[PDB]
Symmetry: D2
Subunit: 333 residues, 4 copies
């Protein structure tokens, strides 16, 4: 299988390699570009605060990591057009920096000699894939594709199942989510977002997300029908997404749960639980989303009905399992 380069060896970038080795993928990771020395990247890869020790050996040289006995080139080019992707033949770039989230920006990797780029974040109006929701839309002509956010990978499977079974007329989502590197440790400036400047592990922090707003890139029939936001909270990873919908049909909780159970069957992207789990129980999940039947709520007065559905997600590893599913298919095309 294809050779891969990772741009941005951060939380997502590191976990991309972790998961590729875990599934014994035929993808060959040949190069990493970041901003730092191999010594520091080796340290971060070996020791992880959320997932514990790297399951394979890790060393470094002047200009590479040696991971499980295999060499991976390390570059330190702030501008992607300068990355020497041709030197080890990286053909598909997993773009994980947060700084090339558009077609025009990620073109820099094609200019630097890669064939294709898979962006680990929403990236505007480009093909945007949630594996096992719309990955059938990928074809052999696609060169730059997005996997949207972790929140999108949580929300889309639930929304798709509800829409297929009952119709969603309108809905709003809140995700109660783990804090991430976009936030701040101590109160201090963090770009232009005032809320992002506040100490993440000491606060409930409202936070804008486009997961609902841009859901039409993944599920066309739902364009413009959803809105939402996030409340970021002090858990290191592991998150939960609530959706409150008006559906096309009156339902019971059992009926909603059964429909979802059915959608999750033989679906390695979308899991089901009727156990009273909590966020730490999703840490390390191999699903993009886990529907939780225990939290389903129907509120009805006369002809009016509100349906609340909830799914968990490991915004780090869980999401990464989706990104890797997508990467495997994209590399085959």
């Amino acid at each position: 299988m294809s050779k891969v380069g990772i741009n941005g060896f951060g939380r997502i970038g590191r976990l991309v390699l972790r998961r590729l080795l875990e599934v014994k993928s035929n993808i060959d990771v040949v190069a990493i570009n970041d901003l730092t020395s191999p010594k520091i990247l080796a340290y971060l890869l070996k020791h992880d605060s959320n997932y514990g020790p790297f399951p394979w050996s890790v060393d470094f040289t002047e200009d590479s990591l040696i991971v499980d006995g295999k060499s991976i080139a390390v570059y330190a080019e702030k501008e992607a057009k300068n990355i020497p992707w041709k030197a080890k033949g990286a053909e598909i770039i997993v773009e994980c920096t947060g700084f090339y989230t558009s077609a025009e920006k990620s073109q820099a990797h094609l200019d630097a000699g890669a064939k294709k780029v898979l962006i680990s974040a929403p990236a505007g109006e480009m093909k945007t894939i949630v594996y096992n929701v719309n990955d059938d839309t990928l074809d052999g002509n696609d060169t730059i594709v997005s996997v949207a956010s972790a929140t999108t990978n949580c929300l889309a499977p639930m929304a798709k199942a509800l829409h297929d079974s009952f119709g969603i007329e309108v809905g709003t989502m809140t995700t109660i989510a783990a804090y991430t590197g976009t936030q701040s440790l101590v109160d201090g400036p963090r770009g232009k977002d005032l809320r992002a400047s506040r100490a993440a592990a000491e606060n409930i922090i409202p936070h804008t997300t486009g997961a609902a707003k841009a859901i039409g890139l993944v599920i066309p029939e739902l364009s413009g029908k959803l809105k939402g936001h996030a409340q970021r909270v002090p858990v290191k990873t592991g998150s939960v997404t609530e959706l409150v919908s008006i559906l096309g049909k009156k339902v019971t909780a059992e009926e909603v749960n059964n429909a979802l159970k059915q959608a999750t069957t033989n679906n390695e992207s979308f899991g089901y639980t009727d156990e009273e789990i909590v966020s730490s129980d999703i840490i390390g999940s191999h699903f993009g989303s886990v529907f939780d039947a225990t939290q389903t709520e129907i509120t009805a007065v006369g002809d009016l009905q509100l349906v609340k559905t909830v799914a968990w997600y490991d915004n780090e590893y869980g999401f990464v399992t989706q990104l890797i599913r997508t990467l495997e298919k994209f590399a085959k095309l």
Copy 2:
């Protein structure tokens, strides 16, 4: 009028009841406390507070009392309310904060033990349940035992009242993203029969059932049975937020919803307004029961369908207590 209070349960709420009475220089005096522990320990906890810092007045103790700002408070340690000697120091109104007497029948014990009225710091079934500046006009001179519901109820009710008066609420569901509390667990282990309550609270997002929405009809009778809800408990020590998703009886804009709220909060000592980009730690110490945040208002419309999301902050300890005390000061004078 009545001017002497007894506190049953000198916990998070009990201690803050005393703090707040003193802060507002109430004419109501706490004359007795009933707990399970020694005055030495109660003194220690009153002086040193993890959420609110050092007590602003002097605190000392004897074998059977606290001495707060130089005034003597009796301390009893009776497992069973019916045995608390409330007449000894003349406690007329019991602020019942233990979680163990949340019914008319149960709290009757305080009256059997000599007090005249009981205000329960929690939901307590079908009795008069007051959210100050929503339905406190329902209290009369014949009431002896009343509830001030939960902190979540005090957050939800004012927001729900203002929306309902201006627009009508046809149906709604809430989720409160809430500070963990002493009903939860520090490390994973049994916590009665509730599975989720058994999990380490400072290391998890934990779904948690709450009756705030289900029982809203005690506070706002026209919303009776129209709302549902739950909580997600998260790792902050105090400071919480309630989101309500409603279908209203009129199409609206966010500007219009926020203006209606601004009007309802204006000169309203119980219900505040912000259009600043605040986070939970900025609500710690709030003197409101609920602070509407106009920055989080969202209207989702598709044709004739419309979902309105409104959001209010609450200091589930001190904020709520300010309400409890508003209610207490009025209840003392009927």
Copy 3:
């Protein structure tokens, strides 16, 4: 070969009790857990066993009935007796009790399990002056006549291997210890009474909390030559698990940091209980450790003015799982004596 004892009961299916079962299964021990006594329903114990905040999903299947757990297909009886003397351990023939409640920390208290039909008891905590074992430090003192034994605290299992190595190589004349340690269920979630100790009443995930420990004071039970030569305490802090112990010593010899690190390295060679690191690790890196203690050469410090010298040595420990590994090593040996 005559059968060694192979059937275990766990009293207190708590943080430690659930990890005992976990580690026994993990290492494919020939010891079988046949019964558990706690104060709750199988339903709740099964939920807590399946879902762990610190170590994640249980790696084997878990189901339950009205009076048992079914774990990896094997039935384990569940009893609910608050008094140990009433536990019906004979029903499934539990021979060795792993006593993990915190309520029977003496020989007088734990011999109730013998009354209740067990043959031996291993206590997951200090339990007075009984035989107290830190594996790979003094487990050679265990013999066939020991009936009730302690493995001391997680802090003792961290401290002892370091103190043993230093004392063997250089001599410890006097020393004091501070452990910076994860919070535990003896502490409080919110500020409120917690028995008689004032500090234990404070919100554990929101404070640094000084905390008394006997690990140094009772070190003579494990290393007799240091009896009465050490004091110390803990500072409990807001991490869920994973802890570190610092020891400051006056030694019998002048040393360099390098000579200390090398002596410790040799003491950790061929030693499944005591590890060594020279990497810049932090506490989350010790979570799930299979050692009782990991000596961290990066934190060694020698302060020397003329003839006077103070030596600081630091070891990490996973107070939950790492300690549990030491308990299980001792249990396996106890069972075969």
Copy 4:
């Protein structure tokens, strides 16, 4: 001199202003240099996650803050030598960025028109002041001074009291300390320090500190006699320092506690407690250091004795009170 500028309006820089206003200082803060807009600085000054709402009014303009009705110029120069300090006549700079911690570096403020610099951090071999320990060494001719670290301000009054009473012959320190902005929110590169790269609110993290090694600048007789380090842990502010010493005389715990009690009497910088406090009770302290008699420990075998003494410190607000005490004195010489 009564006109001050603040370089770096961070945790320390903002609390500098808060404390100045709280004590009604006659110091006039005329200018602030940062990198961010006044809008964002206003928001941060108004809402503090550790200390709650700012007690005075705060507005802004495109180039100023208006605090309690008074205008403060805001500049945005990333090089100190370009800061226009002469425009509003800022004479004393409180240097709070962490990037000018030497004489040669802070010289830039003087080239830029200031007359004195007070550095909020250790700054090498220059005049270094712990107030109520050695502020009587501050000289009319000093133009660049340091107030060392929060940890130095905790350690120094305790060490001085012990040393005057008993003699300290050698000693080592460990501070168990709240995390700060030099650490990381998520695992990721943080300069060259590997430990600084790890998620600060999810770990105990060993951290080097010069508080003991450079004690000689403050207490010259203890020069070269102390070493120490930190363990950084997940509390937002509020810290504790332990010192283990060999003293020149045999002592009891009562005797150590009495000597320290005396040292704290009528001492605005050094407090005493015999209550069973924990770290959150130090937050908002007006002392640089609070000796805790409850943790004193004497370990004795034959004629060998080790003495463990312990002091709390609000590494933010507490240290800042010391910085202000020193600034007030400095401004008047």
